[PDB]
Amino acid sequence: SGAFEDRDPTQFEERHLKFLQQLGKGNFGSVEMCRYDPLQDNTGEVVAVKKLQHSTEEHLRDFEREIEILKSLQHDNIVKYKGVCYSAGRRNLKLIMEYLPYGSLRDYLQKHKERIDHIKLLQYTSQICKGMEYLGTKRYIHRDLATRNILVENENRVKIGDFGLTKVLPQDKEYYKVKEPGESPIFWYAPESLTESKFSVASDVWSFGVVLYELFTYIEKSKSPPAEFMRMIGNDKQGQMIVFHLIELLKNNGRLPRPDGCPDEIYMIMTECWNNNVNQRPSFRDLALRVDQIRDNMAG
Numbered sequence: 001s002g003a004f005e006d007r008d009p010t011q012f013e014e015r016h017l018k019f020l021q022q023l024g025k026g027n028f029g030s031v032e033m034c035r036y037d038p039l040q041d042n043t044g045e046v047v048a049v050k051k052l053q054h055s056t057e058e059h060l061r062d063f064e065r066e067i068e069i070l071k072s073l074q075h076d077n078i079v080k081y082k083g084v085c086y087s088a089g090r091r092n093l094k095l096i097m098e099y100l101p102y103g104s105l106r107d108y109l110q111k112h113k114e115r116i117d118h119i120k121l122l123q124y125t126s127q128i129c130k131g132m133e134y135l136g137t138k139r140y141i142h143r144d145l146a147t148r149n150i151l152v153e154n155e156n157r158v159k160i161g162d163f164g165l166t167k168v169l170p171q172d173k174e175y176y177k178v179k180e181p182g183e184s185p186i187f188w189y190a191p192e193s194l195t196e197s198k199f200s201v202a203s204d205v206w207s208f209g210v211v212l213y214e215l216f217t218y219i220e221k222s223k224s225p226p227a228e229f230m231r232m233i234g235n236d237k238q239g240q241m242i243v244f245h246l247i248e249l250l251k252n253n254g255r256l257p258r259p260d261g262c263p264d265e266i267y268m269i270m271t272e273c274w275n276n277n278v279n280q281r282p283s284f285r286d287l288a289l290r291v292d293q294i295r296d297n298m299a300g
């Protein structure tokens with residue numbers, strides 16, 4: 001046979017990666033749960049594995065950028081990069097990550113409400129802010145914050161995922177304009193993202209406000225951002241008319257309503273994130289401190 005030397009534990013061997021479960025599909029990718037069992041004894045770490053539907057030059061370039069981004073991040077509230085697998089005899093690329101048992105925050109909130117109180121919601125809020133502070137130190141703009149894109153390790157820890165839209169700000173620039181085809185999560189977008197395709201830390205703060213709103217609605221059927229905005233706009237509107245009305249609504253101070261049972265001071269945080277004036281939105285550091293002070297002021 002042959003000798004073996006492993007000095008790159010970020011390279012996962014295809015033959016040792018065994019399928020456990022399908023986890024989901026996005027626009028251009030899918031994710032599976034696998035076991036990595038190099039000792040072939042039916043044991044090994046469980047991992048999440050992302051693969052591209054169609055490895056076009058463009059899709060692959062974007063996927064490699066996503067991998068580089070995730071690899072560059074090391075923080076308790078960001079999904080952990082583990083490595084890559086060069087499958088199909090090294091003619092396909094897969095991204096290996098830690099597996100988070102409770103899936104998306106959006107699904108967790110919907111299915112495990114017996115386990116969730118306002119204290120928990122504020123803990124998740126704080127962790128999301130801290131993850132976002134960390135992204136800011138690398139000049140990364142996420143562009144797709146939403147509860148469906150946050151993952152849940154356990155009762156006490158959530159992690160930001162979904163870095164396939166992330167942009168890197170050059171040192172002398174404060175926004176990134178991105179002209180892209182296809183669909184946008186318009187009900188999470190800042191007005192300047194809708195009108196000018198401009199993205200920035202401040203546009204992530206806007207979307208964070210929508211995330212906070214989502215948390216305090218407990219993902220109740222008719223209370224979602226798309227459901228509430230469509231109610232306001234007119235439920236029968238279709239196509240570009242939805243966008244025209246959403247922009248006009250937001251520009252003149254139309255906003256998502258205070259969720260039932262949501263404390264006025266939590267709604268105030270949302271409203272401050274949803275400032276048309278980009279420079280007046282709070283920073284993620286401001287938000288983390290405020291939320292942790294709210295948490296700490298409780299009797300226990």
Ligand SMILES: COc1ccc(-c2cccc3nc(Nc4ccc(N5CCN(C)CC5)cc4)nn23)cc1
Binds near residue numbers: 104151161
């Ligand atoms: C768009 O789909 C995905 C799917 C998985 C991931 C991902 C990335 C990196 C790590 C990671 N851990 C989990 N865990 C997970 C656990 C349970 C579920 N369920 C969804 C399907 N349900 C019917 C069962 C639970 C989904 C994901 N998902 N996940 C990201 C996007």
